[PDB]
């Protein structure tokens, strides 16, 4: 019957500093009638897409008291399908204690495939649609999908590297991570600046827990997030300081199949949300 031109973009080697928003408006204006996007770089770390918006920043408009998690993204992609290969996407805002949540990829398309992609941030590095049913804090979901329906998505990440500290893979998606390196980043004691003296050490706020890798809000019936043959490593987190998962919503699901865990991973594996030491019995966390 007929042929149609599809949208595929190459990003040269180098760093591209921009906030990419691949929404309905982008597709209509570029005549992408199948609302699908393929992006390609010159190699996982030779091409870098980069921005530095953080959730605690000033609000850019009359909406919200702050920029917000879900407006923090370096790249947002929606539509029927998104494919991303051979590049890095980073949010360089920094430590979540200072700049707040800061998304590298807001992955919102019904089908998402990432091959040989490096995602870098700290808190909330990778977000996979959908959002939970209801916000826990006022305005918490302000962003592209705040008032959109909670559509399920299906996501595959192959030979990727994903970095962060706190809830850095999160959302309600059905997602598979296959042969990925999952890097927990150390959260250093922060100096209390009002304790600076001339001849004496300052005081520091230590961190009880170094991080949680995965924070799903999986709906009841869906399989949710699966890590397969993935490696969990750290830069310099201390032993037994990191949890694989905590349930962002009561019934979140995360499974780890034939994964290898560095010694930064706590032997209990999974943390509660309310209470780190009491995992809500409704969570679906498994290590096979
Ligand atoms: Cl897929």
Numbering used by the authors: -4 to 283
Please quote the paper that reports this structure:
The Apo crystal structure of PmeC2 was also determined to a maximum resolution of 2.30 Å with four monomers in the asymmetric unit. The triclinic crystals of PmeC2 revealed continuous electron density of the main chain (283 residues) and a portion of the His-tag (5 residues) with side chain density being discontinuous for several solvent exposed residues. Like Pme8A, PmeC2 is a right-handed parallel β-helical structure of eight complete coils formed by a set three β-strands but, unlike Pme8A, PmeC2 lacks an additional N-terminal β-sheet and C-terminal α-helix. In addition, the solvent-exposed L2 loop (183–202) is far more elongated in PmeC2, while the L1 loop (126–147) is identical in length and orientation. Like other PMEs and Pme8A, an internal core of hydrophobic residues, including Ile4, Ile34, Ile79, Cys109, Tyr152, Phe172, Phe222, and Phe251, are placed at equivalent positions or stacked on neighbouring coils within PmeC2. The catalytic centre of PmeC2 is delineated by residues Asp119, Asp162, and Arg241, and additional pectin or substrate binding residues include Trp243, Arg244, Trp268, Thr64, Phe65, Gln96, Gln118, Arg182, Val161, Phe165, Phe122, and Phe207. In comparison to the D. dadantii structure, five residues differ in this region. These mostly bulky hydrophobic residues with fewer hydrogen bond donors and acceptors include Phe207 for a Tyr, Trp268 for a Met, Phe65 for an Ala, Phe122 for a Tyr, and Arg244 for His. We would expect that, in combination, subsites +4 and +3 in PmeC2 would form a tighter hydrophobic pocket than Pme8A and D. dadantii. However, large and considerable movements were observed for the solvent exposed loops that connect and extend from the β-strands of the enzyme, such as residues on the L2 loop (186–201), residues 54–60, and residues 268–278 at the C-terminus.
